[PDB]
């Protein structure tokens, strides 16, 4: 019931919330949005919205590396995805794309505690000061 | 005078760890002359300790190496204290000696 499609409003508000609160507090960020939970917010951050994620075409090297690795460790996408530097869902889609296109008074009264200054080789007798 | 006690022990150990590092290093590290990063070095301490609790390798891009070898030293000490305490408590619960509501949940989290 809570599940559904992601909205530009929810997604931008997710950007701002993640910016303000920080990465480790999910319940606080899920509190602001409606119809979405904390798990969904976190996985939605790390899966897609995260700026460190690389959204662009795959170069030739990334295709060589992806194909080789996928033939090395079949069906393991969460192991391969960090090695090529792409999202697991993304490299999946691209792979099926490659096979697809490959064929109180202490203050104010009396001076709290008083230290009269000590007296030294000079005359302080005379000195007094003006009012305000 | 107050006597160390079970309620106060974790607080006590971290209190005198903050003091241990503070006295040692601010009497050890110095020449800042004004105030040298005491609040800050301790925040690096708590940061590192959280990172080791989360098993996240903690590397600050800039930092003096004596400060880093410092934090890694004391953090490893507190890790040894915490871990040994965890082992011991699991032994007590295993034998079924201690009935406490808190030490069971805590000890669980530790393992």
């Amino acid at each position: 019931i809570k599940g559904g499609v992601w909205r530009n409003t929810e997604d931008e508000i997710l950007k701002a919330a993640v910016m303000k609160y920080g990465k480790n507090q999910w319940s606080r960020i899920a509190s602001l949005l409606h119809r979405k939970s904390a798990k969904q917010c976190k996985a939605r951050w790390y899966e897609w919205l995260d700026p460190s994620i690389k959204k662009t075409e795959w170069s030739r090297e990334e295709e060589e590396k992806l194909l080789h690795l996928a033939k090395l460790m079949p069906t393991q996408w969460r192991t391969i995805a960090p090695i090529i530097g792409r999202t697991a869902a993304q490299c999946l889609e691209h792979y099926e794309f490659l096979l697809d296109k490959a064929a109180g008074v202490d203050y104010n009264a009396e001076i709290p505690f008083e230290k009269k200054p000590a007296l030294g080789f000079y005359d302080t007798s005379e000195e007094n000061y003006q009012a305000l | 005078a107050k006597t160390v006690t079970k309620q106060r022990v974790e607080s006590h150990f971290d209190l005198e760890l903050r003091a241990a590092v503070m006295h040692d290093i601010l009497d050890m590290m110095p020449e800042g002359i004004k105030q040298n990063k005491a609040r800050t070095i301790l925040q690096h301490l708590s940061e590192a300790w959280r990172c080791w609790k989360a098993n996240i390798p903690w590397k600050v891009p800039g930092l003096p190496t004596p400060i880093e070898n410092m934090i890694l030293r004391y953090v490893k000490a507190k890790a040894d204290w915490w871990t040994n305490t965890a082992h011991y408590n699991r032994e007590r619960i295993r034998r079924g000696a201690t009935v406490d509501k808190t030490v069971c949940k805590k000890n669980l989290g530790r393992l």
């Binding site: 920080g22 990465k23 480790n24 080789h68 033939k71 090395l72 460790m73 079949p74 960090p82 090695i83 | 020449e31 800042g32 040298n36 990063k37 800050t40 070095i41 925040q43 690096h44 708590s46 940061e47 959280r50 600050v60 891009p61 800039g62 930092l63 003096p64 400060i67």
Partner: peptide, 27 residues
């Protein structure tokens, strides 16, 4: 300058072996 301390602004408060190739191609 050396004793500038990075502010500890708080966040709270990978390689692979080639043997996998030999194995996988073997299977």
């Amino acid at each position: 300058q050396e004793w500038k301390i990075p502010p500890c602004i708080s966040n709270w408060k990978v390689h692979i072996n080639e043997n996998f190739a030999k194995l996988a191609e073997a299977l």
